[PDB]
Design a protein around this ligand. Structure first.
Ligand code: HEM
Ligand code: HEM
Lengths: 145, 145
């Protein structure tokens, strides 16, 4: 359950999330778009869920993609900000899951974001330790889908 | 249209928005919930749009309401962060409008949030000067609906 997955965020895992986010969340537009383009490149099958965004290969020049990418980073920001209180992290995660459930996005489908995150982290000199920490966070959202 | 509404966001308006957000945004859970509960108390009819949240009379103690309230504050954070680049503000505001248009929330209906904002600001001692600035930000969103 989401309450059990949230308890998997141990002390060091939370610390690593904060340390990496400090750098990554420093450029929400840049890292946000990079995150989305990497997803579409490594998992072309997910582009179908984003028909409304139009020509996704345009990248930064696509206003709708840019708007979505920026917005996505604020959701991550919200998660990081709730790490201190498990009860608040959970209600924020379930709130966020509502619309993804409506789009019929499964836990397995959501998990495809781990690849893009690992690559963006690596581009910033953050290794496997950090990618695994983020996977743990993503797993909390997966438990709610 | 949205671009034109953004044009009303002058240097002084943006300054007052950033100064007031520095305080209001420091307690997203507290002020977020205060905003929602004030909206429900002053305009009971708006509760119709929030059936999913359940017993909203519970306030902060209602996990779903608390979850939605915290999340709402990150949308405002996004707007505030894009104030210096109209191009980014616009794409973020339009991205934000998508779900509200789908819910059939008109510009007039959305405008009902102005009262709650004015009251929350006043509780922190931010007068009409600041309330007018925020009304202008809400007007940019209204232009997108
Ligand atoms: C780090 C992971 C992710 C984050 C933080 C994230 C964040 C968001 C946010 C904040 C929104 C806007 C609010 C809403 O409508 O729910 C959204 C929309 C959306 N998300 Fe997610 N999401 C993530 C991953 C995914 C994945 C992996 C998929 C699909 C395989 C997905 C599909 C969608 C779709 C289709 C939309 C609507 C886009 C539009 O039409 O503008 N999301 N997501
Ligand atoms: C400045 C004011 C407002 C902000 C910043 C805001 C922010 C948000 C955010 C971030 C979400 C989550 C993403 C989404 O589903 O779109 C949302 C959801 C929603 N908003 Fe807005 N909103 C505002 C005012 C309103 C108003 C006035 C209404 C209606 C009278 C409204 C009705 C809704 C509803 C029904 C949801 C879904 C709630 C749920 O079932 O969890 N919003 N809003």
């Amino acid at each position: 359950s989401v309450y059990d997955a949230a308890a998997q965020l141990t002390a060091d895992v939370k610390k690593d999330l904060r340390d990496s986010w400090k750098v990554i969340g420093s450029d929400k537009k840049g890292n946000g778009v990079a995150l989305m383009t990497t997803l579409f490149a490594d998992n072309q099958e997910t582009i179908g869920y984003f028909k409304r965004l139009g020509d996704v290969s345009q990248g930064m020049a696509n206003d709708k993609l840019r708007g979505h990418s920026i917005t996505l980073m604020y959701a991550l920001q919200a998660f990081i900000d709730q790490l201190d209180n498990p009860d608040d992290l959970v209600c924020v995660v379930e709130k966020f899951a509502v619309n993804h459930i409506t789009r019929k996005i499964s836990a397995a489908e959501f998990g495809k974001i781990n690849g893009p995150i690992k690559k963006v982290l690596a581009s910033k000199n953050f290794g496997d330790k950090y990618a695994n920490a983020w996977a743990k966070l993503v797993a909390v959202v997966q438990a709610a889908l």
